[PDB]
């Protein structure tokens, strides 16, 4: 009824992937919100593609939906901030700290102060809590592990992590059934199908 | 044969638009390269979304495919540069001038020098050739007009500007034919279609 439309999206998702339309697959996953591709999320996080990682998340949850989603966005924006410090771009880190991290101040005033004070350090590994995190690759990996747990525990992600079991190219198969159902009415056959755009006829 | 796949993409494009999956439509248009959505290109240019405008173009042509495409990319990157000057961000303008505009130096050494020398001006409208362009909205509009002509003349865009004439929701209609063709084999009916994922049966 509406599950026709929802299911048809999954057939299209499968079709798009089989056609290697990679970018189109994940935009659809996001805009439909029907399926969260963890394998892809893992990739992009390792690549530190934070804007895309956040934009992909945004088809599933906002920063303040629940405590799980908020911790997910927090860890992402924290690491984004630290990486700026690690390349000594203290200007970018400030930008991050105000535009991205300030939203979390309301909920924990002191943690925002503490993370702000990491700017003044010659190296943030002077802070005992953060004396641990290097290099970037490992931290991301350690973060990804936590992000995975947070996602797999997040209510808004529970039944969106497993793609339906389907035969290969289900949509193409259905399109064939449609052509059969068109050809069976032809008066009569004859297999010179001209288009999918209008029903085929034989004469 | 392969036009099955190509046509099926157009059915999906139409389906995606009817489902208001706006971002997914244009990624597909771009990744497939089958259809250039001028209406969308116009929008984004007016919004000055240059990175997206360029990324959308990139599914159709590279900067150096032909003289038309190159003039398209040039005008886009020129305006992007001027806008930076107009907000007195001479740092961004330099970044643009090296990373984006330098490729055009090879083909016209002197024009690259001339555009570089617009940095040193208190206001680029001191140059007689550029004494004309304000404000941004109008220039974009004037540029869009030229970009439209360039696109409609570009060989790589000739037969990609007109979307095929289709009845509404062609794909949904075909999916129905598929269900009919499944139900006609049931032994016998009975309309309680459970899924699109596996063929329906009646028993």
């Amino acid at each position: 009824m509406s599950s026709l439309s929802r299911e048809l999206v999954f057939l299209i998702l499968q079709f798009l992937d089989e056609e290697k339309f990679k970018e189109t697959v994940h935009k659809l996953e996001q805009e439909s919100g029907f399926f969260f591709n963890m394998k892809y999320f893992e990739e992009k996080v390792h690549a530190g593609e934070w804007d895309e990682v956040e934009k992909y998340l945004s088809g599933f949850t906002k920063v303040d939906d629940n405590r799980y989603s908020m911790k997910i966005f927090f860890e992402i924006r924290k690491q984004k901030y630290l990486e700026a410090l690690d390349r000594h771009d203290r200007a970018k880190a400030v930008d991050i700290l105000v535009k991205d991290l300030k939203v979390f101040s309301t909920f924990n005033e002191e943690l925002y102060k503490e993370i702000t004070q990491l700017l003044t350090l010659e190296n943030f590994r002077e802070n005992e809590q953060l004396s641990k995190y290097g290099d970037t690759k490992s931290a991301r990996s350690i973060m990804l592990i936590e992000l995975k747990k947070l996602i797999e525990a997040n209510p808004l992600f529970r039944e969106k992590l497993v793609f339906p079991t389907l035969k290969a190219s289900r949509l193409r198969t259905l399109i064939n059934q449609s052509l059969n159902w068109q050809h069976q009415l032809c008066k009569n056959p004859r297999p010179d199908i001209k288009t999918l755009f209008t029903d085929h006829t034989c004469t | 044969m392969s036009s099955l796949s190509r046509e099926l993409v157009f059915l999906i494009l139409q389906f995606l638009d009817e489902e208001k999956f706006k971002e997914t439509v244009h990624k597909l248009e771009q990744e497939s390269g089958f259809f250039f959505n001028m209406k969308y290109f116009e929008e984004k240019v007016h919004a000055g979304e240059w990175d997206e405008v360029e990324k959308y173009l990139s599914g159709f042509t590279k900067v150096d495919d032909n003289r038309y495409s190159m003039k398209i990319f040039f005008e886009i990157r020129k305006q992007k540069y001027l806008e930076a000057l107009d907000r007195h961000d001479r740092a961004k303008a330099v970044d643009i001038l090296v990373k984006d505009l330098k490729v055009f130096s090879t083909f016209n050494e002197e024009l690259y020098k001339e555009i570089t020398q617009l940095l040193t001006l208190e206001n680029f409208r001191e140059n007689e050739q550029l004494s004309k362009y304000g404000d941004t909205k109008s220039a974009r509009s004037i540029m869009l007009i030229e970009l439209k002509k360039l696109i409609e003349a570009n060989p790589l865009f000739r037969e990609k500007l007109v979307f095929p004439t289709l009845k509404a929701s062609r794909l949904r209609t075909l999916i129905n034919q598929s269900l009919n063709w499944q139900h006609q084999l049931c032994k016998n009916p009975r309309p309680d279609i459970k899924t699109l994922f596996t063929d329906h049966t009646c028993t």
């Binding site: 064939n176 059969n180 050809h183 010179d192 199908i193 001209k194 999918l196 | 044969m1 099955l4």
Partner: peptide
Amino acid sequence: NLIYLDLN
């Protein structure tokens, strides 16, 4: 010009 499987 399109792939068509006749079943059957």
